[PDB]
From Swiss-Prot, chains A, B:
Catalysed reaction, written as an equation: dUMP + (6R)-5,10-methylene-5,6,7,8-tetrahydrofolate = 7,8-dihydrofolate + dTMP
UniProt-annotated binding residues for (6R)-5,10-methylene-5,6,7,8-tetrahydrofolate: H51, D169, A263
Keyword Methyltransferase: yes
Protein name stated in the entry: Thymidylate synthase
Effect of R126E: Shows 2000-fold decrease in catalytic activity and 600-fold decrease in affinity for dUMP
Length: 264, 264
């Protein structure tokens, strides 16, 4: 996509040499923002083929709130395997915070239900927020959330969403991160009888791994194709009742997939 | 400032009609970002005179962690009076979350100390964050934090900071919000033997009150003046030991102050 390739070129042009936790080098900038008007089309990178099978399953899994990988494994989705203990547990990552944020007085707060009813009843609200950044829970999480916080907004019958991503692997992570939140906006808008607005992406440490440079140069040589279209085949009775088969992408005509590795 | 006036013009040009909680109308956009290189100068709006007395005191107060207004009242700082109960209490707003975030297992987490030692010991970290968005505490707060979350970053000997502001009164609030976080970056950088980098400002619902339109038109007719310079007159032994008298702004040559009202 235009905004995505522009981001990539910026990191290349202006990124500073910066290592990660493992000592793996990157080029890095701090602070960036992009906006995707969801009525333009579904914001799935076209300059390489991006599979959403794992993304759809992960989102349904987040929404279900159980942080054991069993459901992912049921579906041969392996993207959390690296972090899971011998019982398939991750600690209180994403879904737990979304559906059951623990409080000092022993309650568990369902932020997704909170937001849904806020959007229905008080759409002007400036405090329609879901946070995964539960400070007292960070140590027990397999890792700290990269998608830390998101805020919704309603104007002119349209649902918008802004995501704060503290750390962004531009090559490997970002195409998927955009798709995941774009999907969630569509689902929430459907459930609230709203049209889709903008997905606003905001990054903290926004970086290209040095060992993704070959791939970055290749992808930059490619022209974006028309955005595809998201089809929700059925209207479920709630945000928690979506199924994998409910989602179809039409008119996706990507350039070929591009593999990129990780260090250990 | 250039970035600030550009923001104001954007809200004017592209903002949609949007009411607040009281029913007071605004023009609103969702999602914006600005970057202030702090080595350029201290980012205090020059197109109207902006007093920092209250801002400095409020920041020291945040850092002290006690959410009773007594210290503010000691100094005739009245900016929290509207929210405080008959005992001067606000509930677990800003300072409490910064210095003593309560956990389910009965601990209180000092996020400011956490960040300071992270900056000193692991400056590459992509998870150097302070959050005020404590979901289980929102109801007891006099109001939900507008400055929800901030992240720090270190590259090339320079400390940067990004603030996520869920709700922004562009006229009345924003000049002060920028100054407050800009000051904090200077203080933290001093304590970590770092230079100052960028202050990256990110907004959610970013709005101009309709009854600030006269003022907005006036301020837009004015040319920004050279940025002033922040002087820290003394190096305290820690981030918690700053005093009001430690701070001086030099070379501030603003256009005249512009009053703007609030509805009730």
């Amino acid at each position: 996509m235009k905004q995505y390739l522009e981001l990539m070129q910026k990191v290349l042009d202006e990124g500073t040499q910066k290592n990660d936790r493992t000592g793996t080098g990157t080029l890095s900038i701090f602070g960036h923002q992009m906006r995707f008007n969801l009525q333009d089309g579904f914001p799935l990178v076209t300059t390489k083929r991006c599979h959403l099978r794992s993304i759809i399953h992960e989102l349904l899994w987040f929404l279900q709130g159980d942080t054991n990988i069993a459901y992912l494994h049921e579906n041969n989705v392996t993207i959390w395997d690296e972090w899971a203990d011998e019982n398939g547990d991750l600690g209180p990552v994403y879904g737990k915070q979304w559906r059951a944020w623990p409080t000092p007085d022993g309650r568990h707060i369902d932020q997704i239900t909170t937001v849904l009813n806020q959007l229905k009843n008080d759409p002007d609200s400036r405090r329609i927020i879901v946070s995964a950044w539960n400070v007292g829970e960070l140590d027990k999480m397999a890792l700290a959330p990269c998608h830390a916080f998101f805020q919704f907004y309603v104007a002119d019958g349209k649902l918008s969403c802004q995501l704060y991503q503290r750390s962004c692997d531009v090559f490997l992570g970002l195409p998927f991160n955009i798709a995941s939140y774009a999907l969630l906006v569509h689902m929430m808008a459907q459930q609230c009888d709203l049209e889709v607005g903008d997905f606003v992406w905001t990054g903290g440490d926004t970086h290209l791994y040095s060992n993704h440079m070959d791939q970055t140069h290749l992808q930059l040589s490619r022209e974006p194709r028309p955005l595809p279209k998201l089809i929700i085949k059925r209207k479920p009775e709630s945000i928690f009742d979506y199924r994998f088969e409910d989602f179809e992408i039409e008119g996706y005509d990507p350039h070929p997939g591009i593999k990129a590795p990780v260090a250990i």
